[PDB]
Design a protein around this ligand. Structure first.
Ligand SMILES: O=C(O)C(=O)Nc1sc2c(c1C(=O)O)CCOC2
Length: 296
């Protein structure tokens, strides 16, 4: 992957590699997404969940959210990829976190990017001001947060107002990944991915982690691709048995458009090649990513 990396680089062919991926990627219907009744539940016209893998709300009313379950069979890990909640779907979002039993939410975007409102403000920014979403009958409180220079971990309490059951959700917000961009470095990305992992939220005792950006494909696909490649590498301890592009193709069976530019692809080879030093038995690099990243 490291030789492929250098071959690709030497002969300036990331875009064509990426172009091939786009050409190979699956195509499956998104008919419920396109129901007229769901128009205002989608942020982008051109980014939909395929019907086969979409997440259904457990409501009789309208079961539609723009979210997909990415179920990586071999790696044995799933994620739910979703767009940034809209002003009218923040209640659907948290209904889905409750129903799917997720323990973590990864947000890879800011509420504002390039002058636009990429995502509703769907979690509370302070302890005294909880949010209640009447439509799905759920309450959410900030329990605390831990703000780093490039990301923040929130502990959130989610309450199902109908049964009064309560869960803790962890929110990992990467706030320095530009839309249609890459992270500043592999170090700070792996730093952030490993915070997520250490937290327990990836563990198969939970529902699938919710990963989102603005559309739920570019930055998310990047995160997820790196995570699974490292996972696959780990259950074998065998870096050479991972085919990154092929894994991306597996993921795009479950949601379109995963990874939005050829520099995102290239960044994902960089992140997995670096992270393999850790999977391969050198845990001191984790500490190094933490220094490089400048977390504090
Ligand atoms: O948030 C991302 O990482 C992401 O995939 N963004 C997406 S993918 C995508 C758009 C954007 C965007 O935010 O403007 C606009 C519509 O076309 C595809």
């Amino acid at each position: 992957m490291e030789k492929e990396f250098e071959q690709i680089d030497k002969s300036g062919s990331w875009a064509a590699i990426y172009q091939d991926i786009r050409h190979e990627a699956s195509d499956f219907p998104c008919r419920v997404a396109k129901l007229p009744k769901n128009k205002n539940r989608n942020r982008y016209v051109n980014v939909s969940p395929f019907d086969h893998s979409r997440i259904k709300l457990h409501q009789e009313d309208n079961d539609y959210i723009n979210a997909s379950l990415i179920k990586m069979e071999e790696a044995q890990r799933s994620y739910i990829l979703t767009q940034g909640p809209l002003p009218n779907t923040c209640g659907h979002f948290w209904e889905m976190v409750w129903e799917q039993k997720s323990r973590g939410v990864v947000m890879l975007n800011r509420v504002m990017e390039k002058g636009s409102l990429k995502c509703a403000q769907y979690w509370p920014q302070k302890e005294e001001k909880e949010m209640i979403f009447e439509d799905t009958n759920l309450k959410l409180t900030l329990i605390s947060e831990d703000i780093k220079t490039y990301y923040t971990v929130r502990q959130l309490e989610l309450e199902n107002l109908t049964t009064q059951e309560t869960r803790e959700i962890l929110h990992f917000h990467y706030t320095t990944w530009p839309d249609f961009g890459v992270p500043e470095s592999p170090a700070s990305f792996l730093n952030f991915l490993f915070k997520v992992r250490e937290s327990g939220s990836l563990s198969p005792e939970h529902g699938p982690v919710v990963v989102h950006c603005s559309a739920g494909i570019g930055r998310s696909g990047t995160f997820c691709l790196a995570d699974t490649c490292l996972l696959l590498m780990d259950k074998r301890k065998d870096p050479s048995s991972v085919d990154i592009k092929k894994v991306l193709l597996d993921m795009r069976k479950f949601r379109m458009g995963l990874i939005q530019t050829a520099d995102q692809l290239r960044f994902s080879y960089l992140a997995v090649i670096e992270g393999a030093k850790f999977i391969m038995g050198d845990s001191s690099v984790q500490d190094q990513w933490k220094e490089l990243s400048h977390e504090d």
